[PDB]
């Protein structure tokens, strides 16, 4: 190719306030440190430049942020995390080779003990069925870490392509995540089948947990 | 300090063209003097987007010379133009699809190797950002939501905790707001981010968990407001026989 790509690690770094965070960036080609930049992104806010041009801090960036590296391997260090530092961080090659691509991001989240989700399944409401569509909802409540797998089965048949997931930001009181998975069927398809099940895999679960209902029972 | 003010319609129909503009404040594009610091010739007026669930993506840039550089993944769908006399620059992205739904930022890129006095921090980076425009690719017209209950049942409450919620379906544009019991019920509530469905309409759910016994002693009502359509809904969520 004719572009430089940057790969960040780890995908998620889980730490406590006061700890040191070390974020890595590997470029696919050598990049001078003159041209390697780092950014912070906090949900709901515009990205912020942290570091650029041979590891220099941008305006307003406090001393706990520093950077290092050469060749293809770069590091952003936060010496002591503050609560406002839990955010997503991006490296970028900026100034030697267009396009000026970013890495894929590293999220720094708040470490806590593993917590399995509580799982709940909801049938389509009779109100909604009066229309032409059925939504079946599976709720994974208050789990940690974020990685989780939800599979839908209809009459024991694995579903694919007809569901969508949404996930909350980490909770400010208990540091967990919550997730919804919504299965969308036509009313006609919904009324043709009996057993609706969501099956959840998570590090906090010894084996997968299935919640199910039988339509009309 | 220099700021970027973003404008332009974020709502684009599939296959049509997105047009966004930023205006520069606190500096001017037509001032060719260079008396201190870095030359305004070293600013590259840039566009960056973030699609949902993805990272930051560099779209391209323009200098007041008129020279552009574009991401090769776009490049004949993308045009960037600058209007030096108006302190403005613009992004046109044609033939949009749902993959182009994203927050679009403009930003000032800086590339200097010469300067007068002290080189301000932020060189060889995107140091000033606009606040972003959320762009939604959809054919939809304004539409208020339907609000359906996510009701607890005997099977789901048998561990001592009940979940209950509201499915807020098929509305456009963003946002809705959701409260429970007129704002009195906040603990254990999770209102999920909306998803832009393939229909071009949004959907989300809001849930709460409570002790199962409180289903016998407490009423639960979700309060849904969609200002764009002047829609307000209160939906009582009852245990389902």
Numbering used by the authors:
A (entry chain L): -1 to 27, 27A, 28 to 95, 95A, 96 to 213
B (entry chain H): 1 to 31, 31A, 31B, 31C, 31D, 31E, 31F, 31G, ...
What does the paper say about this structure?
In this study, we investigated a donor who developed a family of potent HIV bnAbs with different lengths of an insertion in a critical framework region following infection with two founder viruses that were closely related and underwent extensive recombination. Ab crystal structures show an extended CDRH1 that can help stabilize the CDRH3.
(b) Ribbon representation of PC39-23D Fab with 11aa CDRH1 insertion. When compared to other V3-glycan bnAb Fab structures, 11aa-insertion mAb HCs (17A, 23D and 50I) most closely resemble PGT135, which also has an insertion in CDRH1, while the LCs of these mAbs are more similar to that of PCDN-38B, with an RMSD of 0.48 Å (S12(A) Fig). The glycine at position G100C found in the WIGEL motif is present in the UCA and only retained in 11aa-insertion Abs. This sequence provides a glycine hinge to the unique mature bnAb CDRH3 structure. Most mAbs were sensitive to D325 and R327 mutations, yet only those with the 11aa CDRH1 insertion were sensitive to mutation at every position in the 324GDIR327 motif (S4(A) Fig). This difference extended to gp120 binding, with 11aa insertion variants displaying a higher affinity for gp120s as measured by SPR and an absolute dependence on N332 (S4(B) Fig). A triad of Trp residues are located in the binding site of these antibodies; Trp residues are present in both of the CDRH1 insertions (11 and 4aa groups), but do not appear to be close enough to directly interact with the Trp residues found in either CDRH3 motif (100AWIG(E/D)L100E or100AWWAVE100E) (S12(B) Fig).
